[PDB]
């Protein structure tokens, strides 16, 4: 059972909001199908598959404990594309380019963690 | 009770090498004081502190499990920066600069995580 907090809010309305619809987005909106792809050994290589769009839905739902959770699964699903693919492909120059406003707006993100009720 | 492996190893030997002896590392080295260094409310803001002396030692001593766990770690310490200082802050600003090299890093790192025995 997760919860709402302020950090949360800004992570879900102004965060998920820039990056959902951003040029370099679309690939990123949805779980990597490897084998459609036709990507040998994803499955092998990257053990915590994960996606805006997974993310997007776990806000919406208050999946979440705390805004550490959400930004972890940022983290994993650009960790998991540096792994998989090449420093020069294009799906991890796209990548770069998400993660870099990630961060930027990470760090204009409420500063205390309050939840919040109603 | 962790243990060795590919990519643990090539964040020890490889990543931690390249950003330990950078020109922006040394106030990423230790834990912040943040009494000595005069910040108000840090370890209200900050509830998971995190630093590269720490993580460095994790990597000596086989604290991890896995490379997922030093890479959350590395990630924690970034993110902690830019929720604590302002976007525009020298430290902040060092920080990005770090993270740029880890990531370049991440994307050569081992793709298949094996464990090491002897
Ligand atoms: C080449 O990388 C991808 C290409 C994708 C994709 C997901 C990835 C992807 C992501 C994201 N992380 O690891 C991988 C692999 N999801 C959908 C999709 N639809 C689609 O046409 N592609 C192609 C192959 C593509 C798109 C952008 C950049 C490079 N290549 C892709
Ligand atoms: C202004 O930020 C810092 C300054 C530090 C520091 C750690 C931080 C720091 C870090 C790293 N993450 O959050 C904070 C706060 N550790 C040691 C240290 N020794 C030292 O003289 N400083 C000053 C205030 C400094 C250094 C670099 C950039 C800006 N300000 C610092």
Redesign the pocket.
Same mark, same amino acid.
């Given at each position: 059972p997760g919860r709402v907090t302020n950090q949360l809010q800004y992570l879900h309305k102004v965060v998920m909001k820039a990056l959902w619809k951003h040029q370099f987005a679309?690939?990123?909106r949805?779980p990597?199908?490897?084998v459609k @792809?036709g @990507?040998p050994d994803?499955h092998k290589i990257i053990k915590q598959p994960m *996606?805006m769009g997974t993310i997007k839905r776990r806000l919406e739902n208050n999946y979440y404990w705390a805004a550490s959770e959400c930004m972890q699964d940022f983290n994993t699903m650009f960790t &998991?594309?540096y792994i998989? &693919?090449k420093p020069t492909? *294009?799906?991890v120059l796209?990548?770069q380019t998400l993660e870099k406003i990630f961060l930027q707006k990470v760090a204009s993100m409420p500063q205390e963690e309050q939840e919040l009720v109603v």
């Open positions: 679309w690939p990123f949805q990597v199908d490897a @792809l @990507l994803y *996606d &998991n594309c998989y &693919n492909d *294009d799906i796209m990548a």
